[PDB]
Write a structure and sequence with these properties.
The structure is a homotrimer of 397-residue chains. The longest helix of chain A has 26 residues. Chain A has ten helices and 17 strands. Chain A is of the alpha+beta class and 397 residues long. In chain A, strand 12 and strand 13 form a beta hairpin. Chains A and B meet through helix 9 of A and loops of B. Bound molecules: proline (3 copies), FE2/S2 (inorganic) cluster (3 copies) and fe (iii) ion (3 copies). Chains A, B, C: One of its GO terms (molecular function) is 2 iron, 2 sulfur cluster binding. Chains A, B, C: InterPro entries: Rieske_2Fe-2S (IPR017941), Rieske_2Fe-2S_sf (IPR036922), Ring-hydroxy_dOase_2Fe2S_BS (IPR015881), Ring_hydroxy_dOase_asu_C_dom (IPR015879), Rng_hydr_dOase-A (IPR001663).
């Protein structure tokens, strides 16, 4: 049975046939046609504070390095020396004056240009051997990248998102904490787990203290209560109302939290007393933003969290959660690290366990697609449709 | 060279060509056509003492859960939720009132029926989404399962075995100890090592204290001495005589132990003073039972041992040894754990080492089939014939 | 794209296209057509001091055992029992009277002949089941082996090398220390790193104390200074001048060390005060010898080092460094272990890091061949040409 036959018979209301989650062949397609073609969230721009600042990340097999150039611009490059291929930047992050390959010291300017290569002979044209660039966008303090030489349109999304994101002043953030975990499940299982709160009341004690179980929230017809919340927000100049991509790729919405909760904390109060951004009112709740296939996000009035999904192998996915707070917020004074992070560290561990347990069942040959819940899992259906549709376009001659 | 060509030129008196032991392609065939089609030993029924008792096990990629239902029946099921596939029972064993998937709490009755699924909408037919059953037989206190929807005939074997097994009262046993090890050799190498005692006098000091080296014993024309033993047994009402399957799949025989030995112990005396079953005479020796591809077994007058062979990968096999004793036998009083187990724990470690060393040599491209010993390894020849024959039937259009 | 197309478009002055370094398909070809067909360095003969001495090693999947026979001859054999395939010698090295398989004790004489096999029946012809021999050459105290039944010509190389090697009296050495490491890079990346000192001044602080950075040295038109050194050597009866194989497979040359340095030590003085061999003058420098695909070597006046390259997987290579000193040299008296070894232990660690970092960049799909330095990396070009040419001959119908 071919991939085309599997996609042809796929019905929208059901989880995917086994190979989509477990086969190396579908993983190769997901990499080639999804992760290698769409725009991807990489890191907050505040990680590249000073010029010479760099951060590295792997995308599938690609080795990418992101650096802040001399001119103040942020640029991305393939982290592979044009000489014999070596990684140039081995550390996760750092600062340098120049990009100097540790092998033979071919030296690049922070804009990728090869400015010195020892003893290469008279016929060497350095202009042909600068670092290969990687398409990059700055989404209001959040760095996105695209590995395709023919990137899809980012602008529609950026323009739609700017109003919602700019009120968080992400450019003025610092990273208060980063958590990187590996979940032993296909990247799609990670997203499907993320696009429903069908599993929340049983699996997320801490999260449920502040994050609503309403399917309307964590999922994908605006109710009265919700529109009322949108209104308080927007009356205060804080964009809030539902926005969904034409093609399902992204969604933004500022949702209310559980009664009285202001933030993702055990007591429900703000985690940080010096807010990141100018969100109003204090109880504006959480701006949810997703953008397939790479990222979901929770921007709160006091602090923000980005999540980055990166594929490791058919049955492994790296999830990186970044807590953003105001750059002048002081740990121990303006916030407490444990108190800031504990809820989502626990929620993440609980999701990992769940995803991995899901994956283990799926690996049984007895596993067959099952029906998603119309009322609790329409967001899951929504993601799978976007996924299949994307896969089909890419596979079309 | 195809599998059909390899099987076509195979001569019975020789070990198999390399790929049978080391290739992923033969492993896939062994799983599909052997482990997924034949009956397999799973666990003693005494592990499912109370209703709501369950135990889980993996067979190849299949995730199986075995549970004792409300009606006192023992049933097996695919351990994959009909919603989105998750394992329902994560622990190795436990008790529950209901099968409740930890993901979204789809809840099943202990007979597999879906009795509650949250918010699935009016068009949801729970009768279509009960757990998938797994064929199950109870062989006189030993649970066997078959992953095929068209199971082979178990009854011929069961009827032949009942007389030999029933005198052990396995229904009244408890598990005194379980040992699970992984041997780094193809599952067939584990069986070939098991079907001869050609290697015993050099590799098994402890075992050799009580278990005879006679090829007639551990192997596959009844001598005088042996028939005499069969006779003492059967004169005492204890079935003993050789039984071999028409097609070689199974064999039963109650063999004498080394002079004076009554059990698998360092001193040769009984391990347990409260016997499991009603075997007579005291020196009835050991009932050997094998059933390809899953199990060999030693039932003694005082206690019994089952062994379960499960494939992990082309070059890994899980062997699970279960010591059964009478349910009222008291550890520290009626038997001593170390004394009960030490012989076969050591024998198992020694076999693991041997199998792994065998496998390592076999992985050399220089390895070619070699001649089995007619007198010491006819049981090995017997197993390989059953194996090849099984493979050929399954491959026949 | 086929291997033939990749080889067809390959230009000599560039590093290889990705799959040569990372694909399982090229790894299978390298094993089949290179490592399994060419002569390979195994161990110094002094490791087989006494009769019954043996040493074992893996070559790709092949399991080889090398033993010193009763007649004083050194022979090699496939380390797989002719019965059911088991390794016969499990230890890395040892002594035995006979080769006795630990499984069923089939017993071989040290020349491979099967002299005893228990109970194999009247139709058993032991003459058909002796250990399979492995072609073996003794290169003046260095044991080489060839896994092909139709070995290439070793004699041209041996005759060319004898004059250079014999003055080191390798037959009179002992192993003072062995270091085995795994580098996470393709075996070709290990060689390319070895065939240039383009990376030396930045990566090898210790080595650079005594080993010259002149490309003429570590690389592949004899300058005045160098010929002068050749002359001092050969005037003293010590062969020194450049020898390169017709087909690029091997090279020998006795190069001068850094000003005043006599050996690979932190202080530059001799490591051992009792010299191995009769090299003269004291500052004769280092005899470099390479032989693709298995070995590079540094023979100094006081002691010698062999390096053995063996493939582990597409992206892993085992490098084994052996320090040879005179058999009567006494540790703690005639040399200090740390002082003898520290330079090349560090150099090796530094190379491992470099190779692994090279490999990591290469695994990016963005990696493309790049230009080798004509003046610093002609030795690299030389190795890659030998490699491609070898691969092409072997692939020719
Ligand atoms: O339970 C969680 O953690 C995520 C939040 C959005 C939907 N599910
Ligand atoms: O040696 C052993 O442990 C097994 C027992 C039956 C044949 N070989
Ligand atoms: O740097 C090193 O260690 C090796 C020596 C020969 C060429 N490169
Ligand atoms: S690989 Fe970067 S300088 Fe050689
Ligand atoms: S997977 Fe079992 S309830 Fe959703
Ligand atoms: S495998 Fe060597 S004696 Fe049986
Ligand atoms: Fe969750
Ligand atoms: Fe055994
Ligand atoms: Fe080096």
């Amino acid at each position: 049975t071919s991939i085309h036959q599997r996609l042809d018979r796929r019905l929208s209301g059901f989880s995917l046939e086994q190979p989509f989650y477990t086969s190396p062949e579908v993983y190769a397609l997901d990499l080639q046609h999804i992760f290698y073609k769409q725009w991807l969230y990489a890191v907050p721009v505040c990680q590249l504070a000073k010029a010479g600042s760099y951060t590295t990340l792997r995308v599938g097999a690609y080795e990418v390095v992101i650096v802040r150039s001399r001119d103040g611009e942020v640029r991305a490059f393939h982290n592979s020396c044009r000489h014999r291929g070596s990684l140039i930047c081995k550390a996760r992050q750092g600062q340098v004056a120049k990009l100097v390959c540790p092998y033979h010291q071919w030296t690049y300017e922070l804009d990728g240009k090869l400015i010195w290569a020892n003893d290469m002979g008279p016929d060497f044209d350095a202009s042909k051997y600068g670092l290969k660039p990687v398409n990059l966008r700055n989404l209001d303090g959040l760095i996105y990248i695209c590995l395709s030489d023919t990137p899809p349109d980012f602008q529609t999304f950026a323009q739609l998102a700017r109003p919602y994101l700019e009120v968080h002043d992400l450019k003025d953030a610092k990273v208060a904490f980063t958590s990187t975990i590996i979940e032993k499940g296909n990247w799609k299982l990670v997203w499907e787990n993320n696009r429903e709160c069908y599993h929340c009341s049983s699996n997320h004690p801490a999260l449920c203290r502040s994050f609503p179980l309403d399917p309307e929230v964590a999922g994908v017809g605006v109710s009265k209560k919700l529109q009322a919340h949108f209104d308080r927000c927007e009356a205060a100049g804080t964009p809030a109302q539902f926005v969904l991509a034409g093609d399902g790729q992204y969604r933004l919405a500022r949702m209310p939290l559980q009664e009285k909760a202001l933030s993702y904390t055990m007591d429900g109060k703000a985690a940080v007393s010096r807010h990141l951004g100018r969100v109003a009112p204090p109880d504006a709740g959480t701006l949810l933003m997703f953008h397939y296939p790479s990222t979901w996000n929770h921007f709160l009035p006091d602090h923000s969290l980005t999540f980055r999904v990166m594929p490791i192998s058919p049955t492994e996915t790296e999830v990186t959660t970044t807590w953003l707070v105001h750059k002048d917020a002081v740990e121990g004074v303006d916030y407490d690290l444990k108190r800031l992070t504990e809820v989502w560290i626990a929620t993440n561990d609980e999701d990992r366990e769940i995803v991995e347990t899901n994956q283990q069942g799926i690996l049984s040959p007895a596993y067959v697609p099952g029906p998603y819940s119309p009322g609790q899992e329409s967001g899951v259906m929504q993601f799978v449709d976007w996924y299949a549709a994307s896969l089909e376009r890419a596979l079309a001659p």
